Structures are given as structure tokens and as C-alpha cells.
Amino acid sequence: ASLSERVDAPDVVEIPSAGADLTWRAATKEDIPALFELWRAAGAVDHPTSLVMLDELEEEFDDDDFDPALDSVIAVDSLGRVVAFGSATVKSAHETVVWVALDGTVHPERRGEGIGSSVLRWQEQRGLQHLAESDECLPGWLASSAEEHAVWTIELFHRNGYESVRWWHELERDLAQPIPDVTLPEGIRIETYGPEWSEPTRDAHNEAFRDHWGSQPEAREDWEAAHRLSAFRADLSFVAVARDQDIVVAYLLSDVNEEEWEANGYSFGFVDLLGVRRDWRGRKLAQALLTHAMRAYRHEGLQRAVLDVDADSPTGAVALYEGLGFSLVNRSISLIKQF
Ligand SMILES: CC(=O)SCCNC(=O)CCNC(=O)[C@H](O)C(C)(C)COP(=O)(O)OP(=O)(O)OC[C@H]1O[C@@H](n2cnc3c(N)ncnc32)[C@H](O)[C@@H]1OP(=O)(O)O
């Protein structure tokens, strides 16, 4: 049955009103600098090793899938300080799940007074509208996440009926320790990523991540947007290329965010995406790309490689990273309510 029939979505969503010194409204792009400061204040408590970047907020507000008039709320105190924000955002196409991202936060100094509950209550009402409006016969997931230490976020989500449904491990690899050498199958070469590989790599990724939990295919616009972020490092990203005519059979995309080095305790490159096409797996291509990237990171003087992995990876990514010397740093949790 359709989500528009399974979900009883409100005809009208009420912006919050609670907080005697608070004024609430939808956010606009003009709020981005104050939101940056909010996210940084909150992240110092909730996720100090990961920094929200200004250009991420800019791309989010510029995304055609995001209507800030209907998909965002912001709370301002009596001195005009921004103290909370929430959004509820859905993409335009869905493959196996209708994913609604419920992103928001409350300033650490204004927690424990019901402001988070107000934000999540609003996010869920708008989220139900996103689900019904999708008119899809797929699971509907209203979703957020938290680092395991952020019990204040986790407990708010559990209190509201969201469940911990998936676990993520951040892993690090010391680039000063020996990096193994791995050979490629015949007919395969490694190239540095660049614009000419964008579409072949998007195609490879969308196939490979059919086997990753939750993932939906990446539309071209969103793919290209993520590559405009200052953190993306095309020259530390690599593809393995075979002949079918060339095709990308494995790929590894990297970020470098030097503003995160201090809190993480080392300089590091971040493995953002790593995939191998189904028919080319079990041939060491992931190892070949990871080791190639680790040598590239080391040559630039970076101390570590860092990445995230589904703790229950169905294609064995955990064993892959463990065998290459990655070790646990931190854990995070997907918090989801299903319709
Ligand atoms: C940073 C991120 O993006 S995290 C998400 C990781 N990417 C994905 O999940 C995408 C979907 N999966 C894939 O693309 C592929 O299956 C990958 C990337 C996990 C691995 O692809 P491959 O090229 O076949 O990896 P590779 O051949 O180099 O290494 C295989 C290793 O996996 C490990 N492994 C353990 N159990 C399994 C399993 N059940 N199935 C597969 N691999 C397993 C082993 O350590 C194995 O090494 P071995 O040679 O000693 O046996």
C-alpha cells in the first residue's frame, strides 16, 4: 500500500511555539552564518571530531529538493541569538526506501527545557507530509543519527519512538606503519579522479552501493554538488579502470578537512566513498585503491587515514579495513522511525 494511505499526514504543520523567551520561524539563507555558529557550538559537545562547514550549509540551502519555507524552523532567544534549528528534507527519487532526513540541533546552553522535543515534533509532522507526498509503495524512514556518546540526542530520539537501527564505526589507520603492496588484475589500471571520470564513477557507485545498507542511487546534480565542497580532494581520489571501451570498476573518493585535524589528534585524509562493482569483487581492487590512497596521503604529509563503516557491512567491509590496519576510533548510530 502507498505511503499516502499508510501515513495519516497532517494537512497543516504547526511551527513550534514553546519557550517563553523564544521566537520561531522558518529559516532562510540569510540565517546561514548564525546557523554555522550554532552547529559549531552544538558539535563541540555532540561530535567534536566532525565540523559542519559553511559550504555544506550553503549547498544545503541551494538544493532544489529543499524548500526552507516549509522544510526548516529556527528558534531565536530574546537577545536575538539563534538557539535551535531543525529541518526535514526529502529527495525527489526513491529506490528502496523513502528517506526523510531530520537534521537539527539545540544550543548546548538551552538543553533540557523541551526545545529539542519541540524541534523533533515539528520535524516529524513535516516528515509525515514528505512521506505521504512521495506516493511511493516503499518503506518510509524518518531518520537522524548520533555519536554513541551523545546520549542526550539518543535519549530524545528513543523517547519519541525512534529506534537505534544501524551502527557505524569510525576507523583510523596510522600512515607511518608499513603499507602493503597489492597487484591489479591484468587489463586494469589506476587513474587519478577527475571530471572525465565523474559520470563513469557515479554509474559505478550507484551499482556498487545497491549492496550497502540504506543507500539510494545518487542523482547527477547531487553527485556534482558534493564535489564542489572545499573538503573534496580530486587529486587524492582514484579509480580502477578496465575495458568492456573503459569503465570504472572500483573507485575511492577522498576529503581533507584541515580544520578537523586538531580535534582528531592528527592530520588525516578521509575516505569518503569506496566501492567495487559486484562482478569485480574478490580481486583485491578495494585493497589496491586503499593502499594507493594511503601512500598518496602519506606523501602529502598527512598522518592518518580515516573512514566510516557499517558495523554490520554485508559485503565484509569491516574485515577489509581491519586487515589493512584500520582500528576503531568512535561509533555512531542511525535513529529511525519506520512507516
Ligand atoms: C568508506 C566507505 O564507503 S564504507 C562502505 C564500503 N563500501 C561498500 O560497502 C560498497 C559495497 N561493497 C563493495 O563495494 C565491495 O564489496 C567492497 C568494497 C566491500 C570490497 O570489494 P572487493 O574489491 O572485492 O575487496 P578486496 O578483494 O580488495 O578484499 C576482500 C576482503 O574482504 C574481507 N571479507 C571478509 N568477509 C567478507 C565477505 N563475506 N564478503 C566479502 N569480503 C569479505 C576479507 O578481509 C577479504 O580479504 P581476503 O583477501 O584476505 O579474503
Ligand SMILES: NC(=O)C1=CN([C@@H]2O[C@H](COP(=O)(O)OP(=O)(O)OC[C@H]3O[C@@H](n4cnc5c(N)ncnc54)[C@H](OP(=O)(O)O)[C@@H]3O)[C@@H](O)[C@H]2O)C=CC1
Ligand atoms: N537530530 C535531530 O533532528 C535533533 C536533535 N536534537 C538533539 O537532541 C538533544 C536533546 O535536546 P534537548 O533540547 O535537550 O531536548 P528536551 O529538553 O526537549 O528533552 C530532553 C530532556 O529534558 C526534559 N524535558 C523535555 N521536555 C521538557 C519541557 N517541556 N520542559 C522541561 N524539561 C523538559 C526531559 O527530561 P525529564 O524527564 O527529566 O524532565 C527530556 O528527557 C540535543 O543534543 C539536541 O541538539 C534535538 C532535536 C532535533
